[PDB]
Design a protein around this nucleic acid. Structure first.
Ligand SMILES: Nc1nc2c(ncn2[C@H]2C[C@H](O)[C@@H](COP(=O)(O)OP(=O)(O)OP(=O)(O)O)O2)c(=O)[nH]1
Ligand SMILES: [Ca+2]
Ligand SMILES: [Ca+2]
Ligand SMILES: [Ca+2]
Ligand SMILES: [Ca+2]
Length: 341
DNA sequence: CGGAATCCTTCCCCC
DNA sequence: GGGGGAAGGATTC
């Protein structure tokens, strides 16, 4: 079982560099401007030049600006990045039919059959890196190991512009040594629940009774961490399909008035339907971000597909359910469509 | 800020 | 008891 994982370097910012190569070597910050005030919003991502001074995804644009007032600041152009991404995914398909497209810039390949060992896999990685650099001018990091999770960890270790193999020797070392928060699927909230159980590396998950562990982090994540620590995680590379299309926008002011919020809600529906492109959903959810950054939602599944008129009509009802049930002001409002025919 | 998958809890109808 | 599904949250990348 040889898995090869491809993670494109600093993706959105690198694409902006490709479309304007004079950006190269400058600090580049790709931003999402919320329209609430001058430079309100956040960093989607940044190239390494900006990153090494602390400008990274998630910080406010305002804070980025005071660290690096002279950086290049660009609005996020997701549609472009998506088209570049799928071209790169298409080239990867030429190296295996077993491909899992995990996000806009991550893919796993099953190269068990195209390759005999880690030496040949490491060479196939170099072929792949070079191919993408030649055809689209994008640097990527490659991780190689015996399963998806360890291929991913490999990439995290080698980035940027890297390639790394975690064989079987190193896999066993990492179970004892890798900080458990660096395990994919362990975010901040789970990392902290695991600390309380005194689980600081993967190996610790075996020293603890299962029912306790699933008591804390849930059954799925429990079985997940256990198989990994046991060196028997072996999930298949699986072709993934879109299950839901949606869109959420930020309001210029926090509000509670139905008629203040509606045009934002309707805009979200309009873009959501364009994105849907001949897909017909049976389910709609109205999603609200309240003033305290909390996320509330109300939804409805239909026996049939939802027409645009029905989306418009139903969304107002669900938004009304939200305002009836939750006393707080709304900051962001949007919709999500799913259960496609 | 933003898009989306998977998972968890609760509640429900009912064999 | 338990299957099957929906709803509203929680959590991750
Ligand atoms: N709007 C938004 N987009 C994000 C955020 N984080 C990541 N993205 C987008 C932009 C990234 O370029 C892309 C890929 O995610 P990554 O975690 O791999 O970061 P990135 O590629 O920028 O750099 P990396 O090489 O992994 O260090 O997804 C975020 O907090 N907000
Ligand atoms: Ca990346
Ligand atoms: Ca990534
Ligand atoms: Ca983490
Ligand atoms: Ca049950």
């Amino acid at each position: 079982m040889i898995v090869l994982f491809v993670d494109f370097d600093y993706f959105y910012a690198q694409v902006e560099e490709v479309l304007n190569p004079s950006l190269k070597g400058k600090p580049v910050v790709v931003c999402v401007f919320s329209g609430r005030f001058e430079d309100s919003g956040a960093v989607a991502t940044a190239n390494y030049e900006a990153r090494k001074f602390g400008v990274k995804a998630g910080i406010p644009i305002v804070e980025a600006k005071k660290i690096l007032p002279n950086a290049v600041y660009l609005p996020m152009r997701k549609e472009v990045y998506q088209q570049v991404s799928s071209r790169i995914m298409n080239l990867l398909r030429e190296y295996s039919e077993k491909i899992e497209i995990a996000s806009i810039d991550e893919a796993y390949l099953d190269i068990s059959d195209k390759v005999r060992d880690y030496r040949e896999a490491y060479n196939l990685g170099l072929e792949i890196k070079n191919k993408i650099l030649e055809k689209e001018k994008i640097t990527v990091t490659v991780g190689i190991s015996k399963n998806k999770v360890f291929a991913k960890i490999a990439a995290d270790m080698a980035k940027p512009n890297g390639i790394k193999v975690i064989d079987d020797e190193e896999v066993k070392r990492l179970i004892r040594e890798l900080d458990i928060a660096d395990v994919p699927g362990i975010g901040n909230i789970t990392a902290e629940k695991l600390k309380k159980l005194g689980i600081n590396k993967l190996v610790d998950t075996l020293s603890i009774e299962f029912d306790k562990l699933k008591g804390m982090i849930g059954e799925a994540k429990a079985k997940y961490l256990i198989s990994l620590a046991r060196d028997e995680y072996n999930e298949p590379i699986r072709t993934r399909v879109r299950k839901s299309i949606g869109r959420i926008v930020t309001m210029k002011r926090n509000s509670r008035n139905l008629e203040e919020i509606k045009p934002y809600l309707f805009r979200a529906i309009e873009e959501s339907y364009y994105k849907l492109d001949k897909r017909i959903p049976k389910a709609i959810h109205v999603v609200a971000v309240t003033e305290d950054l909390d996320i509330v939602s109300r939804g409805r599944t239909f026996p049939h597909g939802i027409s645009k008129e029905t989306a418009y009509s139903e969304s107002v009802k669900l938004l009304q359910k939200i305002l009836e049930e939750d006393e707080r002001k709304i900051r962001r409002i949007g919709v999500r469509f799913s259960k496609f025919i």
